[PDB]
Write a protein that binds this ligand. Structure first.
Ligand SMILES: Nc1ncnc2c1ncn2[C@@H]1O[C@H](COP(=O)(O)OP(=O)(O)OP(=O)(O)O)[C@@H](O)[C@H]1O
Ligand SMILES: Nc1ncnc2c1ncn2[C@@H]1O[C@H](COP(=O)(O)OP(=O)(O)OP(=O)(O)O)[C@@H](O)[C@H]1O
Ligand SMILES: [Mg+2]
Ligand SMILES: [Mg+2]
Lengths: 604, 615
């Protein structure tokens, strides 16, 4: 019967007293296949009505029915179908996408309809031939005149061949010639069974119409028909209960390439929120290695203990003991030159004593295994007892006399008169007797301290100094807190860094969605390309991230001598899975809230 | 004679093959005061010529002279004057500022002309009356119909009363009534001596002109005059505190209009401060605890291992680069308690402050006082180990020992770090060994003085009072080493992560800023076309920065403060100890960068041709 049936339709804008009655109880039935012109004084409610017809706004009250189906009661996907295939909207202000070419802007409504890419551009190119723009099919909106942008918009409305053609002042910026050709086009579509509803001020234009309504002050004044109207049986209907994503992907890429700055900055914001987190964890763990090492080297942790050499032999066969020393001393008198140093000390020590006490080799060598087996008369000198006896001259080789008994100096060591000879030499050639003073062991770095104090009580029956092993465990807990709490900062920092740039750059195209929704796209078609726009830009900025920090580590480890930046593969994972799980969340959230607005509200 | 003189004017766009010849050797002299209508096909070059006349574009080649003065040779502020006072431009696409009301948009061109704000709104309101929008003077562009937007544009163009009115399809979205009223307005201004150049497609509109030019394919086909032009009297030429006081008011409204952009940018600089500051202060705090844990593992000392007098060690202690001093002298002998008789014990004859020099701390009882060393007392302080062995697990305070058949009264115990015993040096040189010569002198080097400086400062300071040898100075300073060695490592740590976190949050501001302001390069192109001078842009975009920079700065320095308080409260261990040098550095950096990236873009826009900015 009718194709559009509007009864009691009211419309308000504003808050009140800031509110205005814009469409007032207007009741309008438009007959299928008619050619209608709507005229009226500027600001009378014409564009407002056109929107509620094309399902871009929604009326405050009253019914509006397309092919008798109440519009408000349709579903959101059902509406997107109408906008793709029954309606073909020519916007007053033409509403192109600025980043797309002319042709690309025309074909866009036909991607969401789902025709092959090759078919689109040839048709889109023909529509731009019919409307005089075949010359300018590659120009973008801002490379065209207004009258050209207008015709681009006209072509788009005709791309999906919609039954109805809503045309809001579609001649406005056009000369008489270009404007007639446009009326030629619309007339022939009327002739092929299309329905035309056209707002215009030019009368010659309105003459092509068989019906002419006049609106004034939100109400409808005139209603004129030249002829009766041919009857028409309604088209079947346009309702659609994988390739969709191939297209969504292509859109997302072109979108990203179009907005090089927003994209590059966005991804550069993810790049940092990774390399910053990663570089502080790796600088932190590198300065901890050195600091703990600088502490371990200030002295060792040891356990000084019927104590014969087979005790200290089996004691050295553990992995919780890394070195051992039999001990025995002597109090006597030395001689070099005429001088005779009295009450010197000759410490009878073990193979590994200079490892057990962390004394490091200055000059020459330390007591070898041959020296302790043969009870050699060779002495390693204390740094101090070496400078005092030999002034500032090489003492290597030269001899001393402890208890009228020669000793050949073989080396020097550090500190914490002192002399170091084997225990075999002091118990054979200085004191006699087979009993030794004590046994000292160097407890490992990893094993627990108070565990071994009771693991040695057990293992021998079958005192210990450990203040380094304390201030080690004590400063590893401080370096943990430090690294841990600055990693937490740099991570919260660079997440908010992503959020900001992502929130800004996306909301900055809420009108792009509003166009996409008006031209047929379904809600889900938006989320497709805006997720793909995020992950695609997040996991390129992530890759760039993990291997920009790598390059920083190399640069650091090359020029820096003090300590090495040692990376953590846990931080890498954390920082990446965080900076993308946050960038994707804030690239989707805003695009969705837009896609679920009334297109006109999104269009402002 | 002529008010506009355009000879040989050419114009191109693009890069061949993408290049197009748009205005082709067009010569056109327009007589002062005329009413001219330009017509032609869509995309023939009409809007392009209109822009070149109104000084929004500039021709590729040829001359274009307003009042006989060549335009390209004018200065960038001389042009900005023309656009405010000679031209009144009605844009094809109406080009309103979306965040301003209808009235605010119409008055704007009168800021940069410099008229008081109370007169602007009343005139702007009147222009909207004359054009029918007095009803809607508070509506923002997106609360208006297209035709209403159009009339707001027309109103704005008539706000500075410019001599020439360039109208690019001024009636296109208007019914015939509104459209005619607009023609009525233009016609009257013509009568009042204005000059009108109007692009249109409607012919009834074109009739209200005495001169009608038709352009096609960038050339001029038609040139018609109905009546001769009324003779022309040339008009007079038209070429900071307030200026700024207004710019500030624009910047505040601008900021409030873009609440998200603003809050996020300022939140961006908030972090770029609190992050830098909270890592400098977490780092310095953990250094304090780490360096302390090291210093507390032992001291640094210089033992001067005869010719060695107590007056040497007496003068030695009177420095500020020496904190304590000890005379030394030992004894090897035999002890007795009960029936037991411990062989080869050790009795260390030591000084008043020996337990501060080696950092040994007091367990129980007391240490050797000044009375004991002055009287050569027979009192001994016991080693923790030589205390537990001799007295099992019983209080040793008071009870006696016998070193070389000579009693000694125990007075206390010590920390540690054969049997070790501590007695005064006066007691060992009088009551155990005899002789007046001592073993050595040990000094405790101060924490702040350099080590190898003092090793050569005591060689000097003691030589000055004769007594050498010995001076065979040893120096145990491996603690003093492994503090300087980890303070350099903690320096490189806090220094390089403070550099990271700083460069991090500087880019974070750049991103959000470099987007936010380029996001309004068209807003500038409008302001430039509608009168503003180059400097007028930089004014409100600097004030937009500093005003949003030093609020997010204040927010930053005191958000970090609150984090510190939270950290120092819940964490026992190292305290977050702030630096007033980082506070300054971080703030003066995150604002100098946010201001540099708020200004840079705005200034690059404001020097583009207004039309190239409008795209
Ligand atoms: N940036 C650009 N690059 C290439 N060509 C351009 C560019 N801008 C405009 N053009 C072309 O130059 C011509 C200039 O048209 P102009 O802007 O003068 O429109 P017009 O003649 O007023 O048309 P209308 O009446 O439709 O507004 C057009 O043919 C247009 O396609
Ligand atoms: N968001 C809004 N808030 C308040 N009022 C509005 C809003 N949008 C539109 N209006 C008002 O509602 C009326 C309807 O405007 P509409 O766009 O329908 O005009 P129109 O009939 O298309 O006229 P034109 O021929 O100028 O396009 C106008 O008076 C306008 O001022
Ligand atoms: Mg309209
Ligand atoms: Mg134009």
């Amino acid at each position: 019967m009718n194709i559009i049936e509007i009864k009691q339709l009211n419309r308000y804008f504003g808050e009140g007293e800031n509110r205005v009655h814009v469409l007032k109880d207007i009741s309008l039935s438009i007959e299928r296949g008619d050619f209608v012109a709507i005229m009226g004084q500027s600001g009378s409610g014409k564009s407002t009505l056109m929107n509620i017809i094309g399902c871009l706004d929604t009326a405050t009250g009253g019914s509006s029915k397309i092919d008798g189906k109440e519009t408000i009661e349709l579903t959101n996907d059902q509406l997107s179908d109408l906008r793709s295939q029954k309606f073909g909207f020519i916007f007053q202000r033409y509403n192109l996408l600025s980043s797309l070419t002319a042709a690309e802007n025309v074909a866009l409504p036909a991607i969401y309809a789902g025709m092959p890419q090759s078919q689109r551009l040839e048709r889109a190119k023909q529509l731009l031939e019919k409307l005089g723009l075949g010359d300018k099919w590659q120009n973008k909106p801002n490379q065209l005149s207004g009258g050209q942008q207008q015709r681009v918009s006209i072509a788009r409305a005709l791309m999906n061949g919609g039954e109805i053609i809503l045309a809001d002042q579609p001649t406005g910026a056009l000369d008489s010639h270009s404007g007639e050709n446009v009326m030629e086009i619309l007339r022939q579509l009327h002739e092929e069974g299309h329905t035309i509803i056209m707002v215009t001020h030019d009368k010659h234009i309105a003459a092509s119409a068989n019906r002419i309504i006049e609106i004034k002050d939100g109400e409808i004044i005139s209603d004129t028909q030249k002829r009766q109207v041919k009857s028409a049986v309604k088209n079947p209907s346009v309702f659609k209960g994988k390739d969709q994503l191939m297209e969504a992907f292509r859109m997302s890429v072109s979108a990203i390439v179009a907005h090089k700055m927003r994209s590059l900055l966005t991804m550069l914001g993810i790049i940092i929120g990774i390399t910053s987190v990663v570089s502080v964890v790796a600088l932190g763990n590198g300065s901890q290695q050195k600091i703990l090492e600088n502490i371990r080297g200030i002295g060792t942790n040891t356990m000084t203990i019927n104590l014969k050499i087979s005790d200290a032999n089996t004691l050295s066969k553990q992995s919780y003991i890394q070195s051992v020393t039999p001990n025995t001393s002597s109090s006597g008198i030395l001689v070099v030159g005429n001088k005779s140093f009295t009450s010197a000390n000759l410490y009878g020590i073990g193979e590994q004593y200079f490892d057990v006490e962390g004394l490091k080799l200055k000059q020459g060598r330390l007591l070898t295994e041959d020296d302790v087996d043969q009870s050699n008369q060779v002495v390693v000198l204390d740094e101090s007892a070496k400078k005092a006896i030999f002034a500032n001259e090489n003492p290597l080789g030269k001899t001393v006399i402890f208890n009228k008994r020669p000793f050949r100096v073989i080396g020097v060591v550090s500190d914490q008169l002192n002399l170091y000879s084997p225990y075999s030499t002091v118990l054979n050639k200085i004191t006699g007797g087979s009993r030794i003073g004590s046994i000292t062991v160097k407890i490992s770095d990893d094993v627990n301290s108070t565990v071994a104090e009771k693991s040695l009580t057990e293992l021998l029956k079958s005192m210990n100094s450990d203040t380094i092993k304390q201030t080690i465990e004590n400063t590893t807990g401080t370096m943990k807190l430090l690294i841990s709490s600055i990693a937490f900062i740099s991570l919260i920092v660079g997440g908010i860094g992503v959020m900001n740039i992502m929130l800004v750059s996306v909301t900055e195209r809420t009108k792009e969605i509003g166009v996409r929704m008006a031209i047929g796209a379904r809600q889900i078609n938006i989320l497709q390309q805006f997720l793909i726009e995020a992950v695609l830009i997040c996991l390129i900025g992530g890759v760039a991230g993990i291997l920009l920090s790598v390059l920083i580590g190399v640069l650091f480890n090359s020029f820096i001598t003090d300590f090495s930046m040692d990376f953590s593969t846990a931080s890498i994972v954390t920082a990446v899975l965080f900076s993308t799980l946050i960038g994707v969340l804030f690239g989707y959230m805003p695009a969705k809230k837009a896609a679920e607005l009334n297109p006109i509200t999104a269009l402002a």
